[PDB]
């Protein structure tokens, strides 16, 4: 059931036709950007994981 399992993939990702698998192990993920903002009794601190 193609239309069922095709819906599970995320909206941003649309994969191409071919895939040359040449191993018994494949990592899959995404490269996201995190913008953290910290606050406590001592004070405030702002950072960013690129």
């Amino acid at each position: 059931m193609s239309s069922l399992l095709n819906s599970l993939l995320p909206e941003y990702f649309k994969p191409k036709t071919n895939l040359n698998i040449n191993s018994s192990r494949v990592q899959y993920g995404f490269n996201a950007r995190i913008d953290m903002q910290y606050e406590d009794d001592s004070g405030t601190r702002k950072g960013s994981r690129p």
Binding site: Y12, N31, A32, M36, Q37, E39, D40, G47
Partner: protein
């Protein structure tokens, strides 16, 4: 890069003694602090997925 409660590896009830002196610094952004004080607030945003 996340923490699940099942990493404790003990079903049931317990109390934890956290070592605050031996807090190593593996990956440091500008946000990263070692000494928390009072009520800790962390607000993060995730954008730019690929």
């Amino acid at each position: 890069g996340r923490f699940l409660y099942t990493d404790v590896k003990y079903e049931g009830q317990t109390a934890f003694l956290v070592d605050m002196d031996t807090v190593k610094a593996r990956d440091h952004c500008w946000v990263s602090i070692v000494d928390p004080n009072g009520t800790m607030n962390l607000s993060y945003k995730m954008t730019n997925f690929r």
